[PDB]
Structure formats: structure tokens, C-alpha cells
């Protein structure tokens, strides 16, 4: 079992990642930490809690950074339309996500993996507030970046663009990094038949996936959970990656040295291709785990 | 009494600021928070605790950020030396930091207050920026921020930048875009508060723990000048009597561009940008007034 | 016939572009202008003149900018060698550059024209930018600019930047903000045109002066490819644009110092909502392209 | 006599610098080159030509760069004087070519005096790098080690073409910088105008017509009973450098887009440990300077 903390900004695809992480026997989901991103933190928190309540996921949820570390906040109704939820009974823990991340890593034996699928604000604050966490982190498997074309701008993918300075901290940490960028995640196109596949499986997870993906196309965040379940399903390439924090046309770009021209040691395993038959099989496996 | 939290990286002149803040009846020093800057946090924390122990200052001390929010860490081992507070000899340290992180202390204290607390940052702005972004509801709770840092003219660590800002430019950008009333004691002002041999003699002659401390500290730093300004303490002077310091309201922007002006406080002295002022920038200080205050504070420790 | 001025820094692939441009009946090559790039201008000029002499191309050659407009000069001595055109041995050089500076030639030729001339820059954009800013009245006279440079994906000289743009980013900014119709043969397209062992064998079979030159030239870059023909794609494009698929995009040149200096930022998906300014090369029919190269090379065989 | 080429964008104070340069026996004014700056090149050229015609200055005038080398053009155009119908014209040679050819043919004794944006100078330097050792010195009006004018960070001439200024400041040619810190001290008051006006002649009337306008639109805008003369300080410097205190500094031009675009970053305290590249103007003896202005005016009588 890979122990993980899932840091997210739900978010339609975050919800799918939560669904997969909380159920699969290859994953030990220790906690869910929430960051502002797709929407403001008040909304992403409610969204995360709504998902956990509907799926009866009893993992603690921690609210983190409501704002990026430096830049003016950007966002991408509720932030998770489609599924209708019960009146919210479950709540966030009283501990700040940044403190939770620090304390959990400090008390561990270095076997915990961070899985950020939102802006990297919680992660960067934790890293700079307690640098002793760095050798405690086994790996960081993040959804974010693009070696090719971004989405929010031609240069930048949303998660990085939303907090470039936080991304710079993470990408200069020296912790082993895995980057599921848009180049990879844009390949995981969910089609009506994928939705129809999951509906027939049914249960709480099946309906939620259907409700979410009907409203929404790529699933992005869930690829990080796929990767931790079976890395063989995803081809990566080791690259030296630098985050551009210059104001201007490449603000929040992940500059990926695909050809090794800079002669710098690689710092990231960059997602290249995904076996989508493998991936959807896994999504269904996770969906079927919620039937009582 | 102005309630303050003094955020600092001792630091020779930080220690002078602590001495002043903890004693003057116009100041209610609620807590001392420590940041990395002059030296690494392990050292600035020991330095701050050493000063409080020697002066018998019973105010809680909180350790904060050991690193800036984004950039690769720099120190000032240029002026402050090995420990970062050379000159005085301290007894073995028995006093310790609180278990609460400085960032949490700042948030909790501001959130629980009625908005009458002033932050006094005299190191890099790392603690302040983290507190602000972690809990933006603190913003209207902050009465004012009186910071030592910046320069409208020439910097120190680079031509463009003063050390506190240069040590965490992204943190400084957060503070200078917060919308909270700012007062900036930049180098243009603080370079005027040069401590001469006779200012040192004046404090030695007054004596007691604080006179000895001032003397050991400043006699060391003046030795490095032969081979000096007090900077941080002007923020405390300003809160005691703002009439002693002439300020000018300016729109100030922090440059976070990598390059020759990284960490520059760009101060619109002539108002050419047509933007509302966000900072009262220090222009001139009455040094007779200032040294009188320093002596007043030194005598408070006479036991 | 498309009238062109070919602006180049020979350069192995520049030589192939000269060979194609000077011979094909769809092209009226008015003049060759030389810029520093692959090597310093003294060398690229000698290289250009060497090519023209060997192929008996009687078109005037003009020396232009020896330096980029702002940055510290870089060369590509890694691929192109000591001379900038290592490989072919040339007879003693008897032919020479015209006395007119390339920048003046470009301005004068455009100003005197009826607006039917196309510029074909296949080196850094230094000559073009200087001409544009020295005489802005040339802008409406330029029919189109078909340039080799840039990359919407990965660069070559850095991960972000292609050599020609990287060698003079500020010049490239001028060209990409000129409002003149632009065609960009970037690396994404040109990397599809690799010259393998079978390509060299084919050309030298066709033989004669251009055959032997292709082979001597392209064997050196294969000997440094123990570890593409780029420039000639611009001439291919002008002969038959149907052989090359382009996509209209808003392209911006990044002149920020840092990891994307000299990047052509290409808005592939139109997310910025700005009007396209460039037809960006996407794919090339390589059967069509090599057919054209042979058509051109055959044109040189002797009686 | 110091041989100079005066590169300018007239411009009220450029006109004063022309007046001084063309008359003083310590200066050999070889040619005037014009650049876009204060106004577009069509207008600055006409302004330059008007000044020369009115003062009967017969030095050849060359039109140069109408645009900066990279950035989108900005402007800041010579009110006060009334000029007769213009008959003088620019030479047919582009100023950039003139500068290159004149330097290449020389023995290295010519000084360049740029008092507009540095566009002509940068293009000439990159077009023909062999001119660099031919340039004895560059005495420029531009920059500020403290506060700029057009932005808090930047002085107009540099701001108008930062990339050109980066070229000049990295050229290795000895530089003298009359920045705003110096020139803002050169305050022309009513008594200074009186002195020139009462000396009389064409240059005294021109000074007076120009500066009266400058003073009227210094009083109406901020009054402020005087206004700086900037460009002419470069000519004062070449006549007698003793009148102006300079300090050697390593200066770097910031070309980053943002709040310090076009800033001259001047290492006043030497903290970067880099060799000085610029003699930066610190203070001027204004009694000396106004005496010299009057002397120049009198040369036209
Ligand atoms: N447009 C858009 C905006 C925001 C997102 C969110 N950001 C990452 C991919 O960029 C994913 O984690 C999405 O949840 C995704 C998309 N597609
Ligand atoms: N050189 C030097 C570097 C850093 C400092 C510290 N930073 C501010 C002034 O820049 C003050 O807060 C000093 O504590 C002081 C000095 N003297
Ligand atoms: N490495 C390298 C460096 C420079 C060049 C030259 N620059 C453009 C391609 O980027 C072409 O115009 C080549 O002449 C080519 C290569 N292959
Ligand atoms: N405001 C103003 C703007 C521009 C100028 C022009 N630029 C330099 C001073 O910055 C001088 O060369 C003036 O001609 C002068 C003034 N006075
Ligand atoms: Ca997400
Ligand atoms: Ca301090
Ligand atoms: Ca080339
Ligand atoms: Ca001028």
C-alpha cells in the first residue's frame, strides 16, 4: 500500500481522484488536504466534503491555503456541478492543512507520498515552514504543468499558473517528482461510452462519476492515482524541469528539458503517454469498490 | 500604549529594537516573533533569546519561518558575523521559545484582537506574508505595519535592494499589496541614525544591563566600519513619537523581476504614476530626539 | 515568379537554401544578404561567397549585421564547426561582397519596389529588424516574410528557444510585432526534414557541382550527428505552399531574461483571443520536398 | 578643441546644447545627428533645422532613427521661439551611416554627445563594432541614480529606448552620464534668463524665448520659479570637466518589463565589486555653468 496525502481543489476531476484514492487496496489514503484553486477555498472545501459524504469516505479533510503564496488569486457555479448532494453534515478538521502535512511527515518513517492535484500553495508553504519535511517525502506525484501547450495560457497549465511561486518551491525542493502534465492528461478523453461503462457498474461511485462527467473531455487528476496503483500504465521521461516565474507570456510555464540540452540532472519524471484501456479498467475497479 | 508584535532577525540592531520596545511606556510589547534573515533561524532565535534573558525581558518569543517564501535563502554574514550578534558575552541560555509557530501566533493574536495591534517587522517579511496569505481575515485587524526595510534611493545588499526586502522579495510583494497601512523606515532614513563613539559613550555612562548591551553591540559594529547606523530601532522610535520622523506618502511597488532590481522598493516620490499612496516612507529623522529616546529606554533597565 | 531577398548565415542548411533559391523558375532571387549567426559575419560571408562561387550563382551578396541588436553575441560553433561550413573544400575565393551594407540594400530595394518582394530570413533576424526600425516605410512594401526560426514546442539551443530567435530575441520581437504577414518554419516543422545516409547518397548520385556540395556539406553534420534541413523549407514553401501545412496563430516573442528568453510563444488554441499574426508550419510532405530539392540540384549539372 | 558629434532630439534643452556646442572655441562641432525622442523624427528634425537656421549654424544635420531599436515608441515640440520659413535641410546620408563613416575615418579623437534616446548610437555600434575604439568618450544626458522622471525608476532618454541604452552601457567605451540627479540642479531662474536676454544676439533671444516658455509652464504646472536645463550640461562638461563633480560607478541598464524598465542601476557604493564603466554626474557649479552659457550666447554677437 502506498501511503498518500491527497492535496486537491475540487473540482470535477479532483472528485474522481478522491473516489479512486479512498477505495483502491494499493492506496492508503491518510488524509485529504484542500487548497483554493478551481474555486475559492470555501467552495472547494464544501465540494471535497460533499464528495466524501456522498461516497461515505471517512478520511479526515483539512482546509489549507485560501490564497496563493504571492500572486493575485485567479480561479477557473458550485465548482462541482452535476451531482446533487445531501445537506452537509460532515466538516473539516480544526487543524490547518499545512500543519497536518508537516506533522504527519515529521512523525513518519519517510514512506508517505504527496499527491497535489491543485495549485501547489499548501505544499510550498509546508516546505518552507518546515524544511525538515523534505527528506521525509518519498515522492510527489502532481497533476500540473505541460511540456507543450498550456490551457489557461499558451504557456501555462492552470495549477502552476494559479501559484507559480509555489510551483517554483516544489520544483526546486530536490524531492523526487512525478508530473502528470497536460501532454499526458489530455490523452485520457472520457467519452459517452466510458461514462456508460461506469453507469452500468453503478453504486454511489458510478452515479457520481456519471453525474460529474455528464456535466463535463479529459480526466486529469485521477491519472496521479492511476500512476501510484500501477506506474507501468504510464510512460514517463526523466527531465530537468524549471518553473518560469517571470511576469509576461510564460508566467507559470514548466520549462521541460526534453532533449537534455541544458546538461542538468533530471528532477522530474514527466508523463508522456498513458494506456487508456488500463486506466479506464482501473477507474471501473475503483467504482465497483463502492457497491454495498 | 501602542500594542505591537515585533518581528525580527537578531541581528545587532534588532537587539536594540527589542531593548527599546520592551521598556518604553508608550509601547505594549505583546510578543517577539523571529524570522530567518541576518543569520539562519536557529541562530537568530538564540540571539533573540540571549537578549531577552540578559535584559530580563519576560515577553514570549516565537520561532517562525526558517526560509523565505520562494527564493533561495541568503544571509547577511557580511555585517553581523558568525552568530549574527557578536560583541556581548552571554551567560548560558536557559530561556526558550514558545512551542507555537510565530505564524500561528500572529494569526491567532490578530484574529482575537479588536484591531488595535501594530506589526513591527524589522527582518525579511517572510512571517508576515505567510500569515497574510494563510489567513486573509487578519488584514483589517492590523492597525498598521511599521517596517524596517527598503530604500527609495540606493540599497545596501545590491545597488537596488535593501537586505530585508532582497532576502524575501515575494514576501515583500505580499505585504506591499496587502492594502494595510504601511510605514517604511528605508535606508534613506535609517542611514541617518549613525552611532558615533560619543553616542556609545552616552549609553555606557547611563549604564545598567541595557547600557552595557548597547555598548558591547555598537563597539563591535563600529570596529567593522573602521575596517554605523542603527536601523531597526527607528521603527520603535516612530511608534513612540511619529513627530521625530518626517515621512512622505508614496505609492510603493516591490520589484520581483530576477535581474538588477530584484527586491527593489520602487517608490513613486513625485507621484508620476497617478496611483494612490500605500506607504508613509521615512525621509528624515531628528537624531537628537532619537538618541534621547534610546537613553530613556536604556535607563528603564537600571536595576 | 516570387521575388525574394534571402537573408542568411551560412551555415550548412543556408547553403542548401541558396542552391534552391538561385535555380528554381518559381523564384526570382534578387539578392543574398548575410548576417552573423551560425558563425561570426566574417565567416558566414566567406561561406556564402564560397557557395555562390562554386555554384556559379551570379546574384549580388551583401554583408549586414555582424552583431545582434542588443544581446551579447552567441554562435552555433557546436554543429557548424570552426569555419561555419566545415565539410566542402572550396577553390581560392575570387568573388566578393557588394560595397552596400545589407540593411541599406534591403531598405532601398523595398522602397523602390511595387510591394511584390518577399523577405526570406533563415538566420537571426538582426538585418530585418534594423531595416524595419531604420525605415518603417518598408513595412507595407514587404509582401510577406517567410522565416526559418522559432518552435511552438521544444527549442534546440535551449528547451524554450530555437537558435535563430535565441541569437537575437529583440530583433525577433521587432519582426513579430511588425504587422507584416509572417510565415514561420519553426523546428516543429523543420525537424521533420532529416537528411539521413540515403538522402546524401541520392543527391550525390544526381551529382555535378550542387550534388557534390550537398554531400560534402551534409556528411559533416551527420559526422556531428554521431550524437534536418531547416532553411531550405522556406524556399520549398514559396515554390509550392501546398507541400506544407500551416496554422494561423498569434505568436509573441519572449524577451525576458530567464528560462524562456527567445521563445516564440505560439497561441495554438487561440486562448488569448488575439488576431493571428503568423502562419506557423505544422507538417511537411517530405516526398514532395525531396523531389523539389532534386529538381533544383539537377539544375546545376554541367554540359 | 574637442571634436564632437551631437546626437539629439530637439527638444527645448537640445536647442540650448546646440547653441553652446556650435559656438564655443573649446568645441569642434563636426555634425548634428537627429533621433526620434521628445517628438517623432519628422518634428525633431524640423526643430533642429529651425534652431540651426535661426542661429546661422552651418554644421551638417543628419536625420537618423525614427523609432527605437525594439520597444513600442513613446514621445514626451520646441515652443517659445518663432521661426522664419525653414530653408535649411538635412543631408541625404542617414545619421547612422554618418556616425560610422566619420568615426572609421578618424584617429580616435571624436567624442559622441547623445542627449536624446540612444537609438542612433546603439545601431551604429552593432552595425559596425570597429567604431568602438574610435570613440574617445560618450558624454550623454540620460539616466538617474535616484528617482527618474517619466517613471519613478527611469529617465526619459533611457526609457524611450532601454535596449539601445543597454548596448551603449555594455559597449566598453568610456561613458560620462549627466543623469537627472545632476541636471535637476541646473535650475534656470528669471535672473539666468535675464543674463542671456540682456547679452542679446540670436542665441540670447533664443535662450530667453525657450526658457521663458519652460518657466511659464513650470509655474502653471507646479510653480516652481525655475526649470532645469539638462542637455547643455554635457557641453559644459566638455568645455571644463572641473565644473562638474563625477563619481566612477558600475552602471547597468535594466531592460526587464515592469517597474524598473529603462532604469540605470548605478552601483554608488561599489557593492557588486565590478569595475566602474561610467563617470556619473553628482554635482554642478551653477555659477560656473551660467557663466559659460552667457559666454556661448555672446559668441553669436
Ligand atoms: N479549464 C480547466 C481549468 C482548471 C482545471 C483544473 N486544473 C487542472 C488541469 O489544468 C486539473 O487539476 C483541473 O481540476 C482543468 C481545466 N480543464
Ligand atoms: N549590512 C546589513 C545587512 C542587513 C542588516 C539588517 N537588515 C536591515 C538593514 O538592511 C536591518 O534590519 C538590519 O538588522 C543590517 C546591515 N547593516
Ligand atoms: N544546432 C543548430 C544551431 C543552429 C542552426 C541554424 N539555425 C537554424 C535552426 O535552429 C537553422 O537556420 C540553422 O542554419 C542549426 C542547428 N542544427
Ligand atoms: N520632462 C522632460 C522630459 C523629457 C526631456 C528630454 N529628455 C531629457 C531629460 O529627461 C532631456 O534630453 C530633454 O530634452 C526633458 C524634460 N524636462
Ligand atoms: Ca484539481
Ligand atoms: Ca533586522
Ligand atoms: Ca541559417
Ligand atoms: Ca534631448
Alpha-carbon torsion angle A56, A61, A65, A68, nearest 10: -40
Mutate which of C157, C163, C227, C233 for ligand 3 pocket (most atoms within 8 A of beta carbon):
C163
- Angstrom distance (rounded) from CA C44 to CA C102: 13
Q: Where are the domains of chain C?
A: 1-303
Q: Do B256 and A68 touch (CB under 8 A)?
A: no
Diameter of chain B measured on Cα atoms = 55
Give B91-100's long-range contacts (Cβ < 8 A, gap of 24+): B91/B53, B91/B54, B93/B46, B93/B49, B93/B50, B93/B53, B94/B53, B95/B49, B95/B52, B95/B53, B95/B61, B96/B49, B97/B34, B97/B45, B97/B49, B97/B61, B97/B62, B97/B63, B98/B60, B98/B61, B98/B62, B100/B62
C38 lines ligand 3 (CB under 6 A): yes
CA-based angle D6:D8:D13, to the nearest 5?
Answer: 105
- Angstrom distance (rounded) from CA C38 to CA C81: 9
Whether B275 and chain A come into contact, CB under 8 Å, resolves to: no
Strand A254-257 relative to strand A234-243: parallel, antiparallel, unpaired?
A: antiparallel
- Angstrom distance (rounded) from CA A207 to CA A287: 9
C164 lines ligand 3 (CB under 6 A): yes
Name the phi and psi angles at C95, rounded to 5. Answer: -90, 155
Q: Which resolution in angstroms does this entry have?
A: 2.0
Quick one: cell of B7?
A: 518581528
Cα(A183) to centroid(ligand 1), Å:
13
- CB pairs A-C closer than 8 Å: 63
- Angstrom distance (rounded) from CA D127 to CA D296: 35
- Closest to D53 (Cα-Cα) out of D89, D78, D28, D29: D89
Question: For the domain A1-292, what is the CATH code?
Answer: 3.90.245.10
- Angstrom distance (rounded) from CA D179 to CA D279: 10
Mutate which of C156, C167, C189 for ligand 3 pocket (most atoms within 8 A of beta carbon):
C156
Task: Please tell me the experimental approach by which this structure was elucidated.
Answer: X-ray
The b-or-e profile of A33-65 (16+ CB within 10 A means b, else e) is bbbbbbbebebbbbbbbbbbbbbebeeebbbbb
Strand partners, C145: C119, C182
- Angstrom distance (rounded) from CA B97 to CA D263: 44
Q: Which atom of ligand 4 is nearest to the CA of D10?
A: 14
- Angstrom distance (rounded) from CA A121 to CA A68: 6
Question: Coil, helix or strand for C214?
Answer: helix
Alpha helices in B76-168 (DSSP H): 102-112, 126-134, 163-167
- Closest to B6 (Cα-Cα) out of B47, B60, B46: B60
Set of chain B residues whose Cβ sits within 8 Å of the Cβ of D147? 152-153, 267, 269-270
- Angstrom distance (rounded) from CA A216 to CA A210: 10
- C-alpha distances (whole Å) from B248 to each of B30, B69, B190, B270, C14 are 29, 29, 15, 10, 61
Q: Quick one: closest CA in C to D64, which residue?
A: C134
Strand B27-34 relative to strand B2-8: parallel, antiparallel, unpaired?
A: parallel
Cβ atoms of B109 and B30 closer than 8 Å: yes
CATH of D1-301, one of 3.40.50.1110, 3.40.50.720, 3.40.50.2000, 3.90.245.10: 3.90.245.10
- C-alpha distances (whole Å) from A231 to each of A184, B193, D158, D183 are 13, 62, 55, 67
Secondary structure tally for chain A: helices H, strands E: 11, 9
Strand partners, D191: none
Burial class (CB in 10 A: 0-12, 13-18, 19+), B145: buried
B156 lines ligand 2 (CB under 6 A): yes
Name the phi and psi angles at A45, rounded to 5. Answer: -60, -50
Cα(A99) to centroid(ligand 5), Å:
21
CATH 3.90.245.10 correct for B1-303: yes
Neighbours of B28 (CB within 10 A): 14
- Angstrom distance (rounded) from CA B26 to CA C284: 78
**Cis bond upstream, residue D224 (ω within 30):** yes
Q: Residues of C marked as binding for substrate?
A: 225, 230
- Closest to A119 (Cα-Cα) out of A174, A68, A180: A68
Amino acid at each position: 500500500k502506498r501511503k498518500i496525502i491527497l492535496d486537491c481543489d475540487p473540482g470535477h476531476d479532483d472528485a474522481i481522484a478522491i473516489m479512486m484514492a479512498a477505495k483502491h487496496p494499493a492506496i492508503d489514503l491518510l488524509g485529504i488536504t484542500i487548497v483554493a484553486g478551481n474555486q475559492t477555498l470555501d467552495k472547494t472545501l464544501i465540494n471535497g466534503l460533499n464528495v466524501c459524504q456522498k461516497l461515505e469516505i471517512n478520511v479526515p479533510v483539512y482546509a489549507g491555503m485560501p490564497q496563493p503564496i504571492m500572486r493575485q488569486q485567479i480561479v477557473a457555479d458550485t465548482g462541482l456541478d452535476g451531482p446533487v448532494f445531501e445537506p452537509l453534515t460532515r466538516q473539516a478538521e480544526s487543524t490547518h492543512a499545512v500543519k497536518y502535512i508537516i506533522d504527519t511527515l515529521m512523525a513518519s518513517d519517510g514512506d508517505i507520498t504527496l499527491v497535489p492535484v491543485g495549485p501547489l500553495s499548501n505544499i510550498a508553504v509546508a516546505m518552507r515552514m518546515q524544511p525538515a519535511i523534505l527528506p521525509k517525502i518519498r515522492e510527489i506525484v502532481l497533476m500540473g504543468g505541460a511540456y507543450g501547450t498550456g490551457n489557461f495560457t499558451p504557456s501555462a497549465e492552470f495549477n502552476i499558473f494559479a501559484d507559480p511561486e509555489a510551483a517554483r518551491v516544489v520544483f526546486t525542493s530536490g524531492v523526487p517528482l512525478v508530473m502528470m502534465g497536460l501532454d499526458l492528461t489530455n490523452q485520457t478523453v472520457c467519452t459517452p461510452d466510458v461514462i456508460a461503462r461506469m453507469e452500468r457498474a453503478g453504486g454511489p461511485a458510478g452515479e457520481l462519476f456519471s453525474d460529474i462527467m455528464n456535466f463535463t473531455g479529459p480526466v486529469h487528476d485521477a491519472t496521479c492515482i492511476g500512476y501510484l496503483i500501477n506506474p507501468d500504465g504510464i510512460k514517463t521521461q526523466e527531465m530537468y524541469v524549471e518553473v518560469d516565474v517571470n511576469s509576461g507570456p510564460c508566467y507559470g510555464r514548466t520549462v521541460c528539458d526534453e532533449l537534455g540540452v541544458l546538461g542538468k540532472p533530471a528532477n522530474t519524471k514527466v508523463g508522456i503517454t498513458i494506456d487508456t484501456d488500463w486506466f479506464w479498467g482501473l477507474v471501473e475497479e475503483c467504482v465497483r469498490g463502492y457497491i454495498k
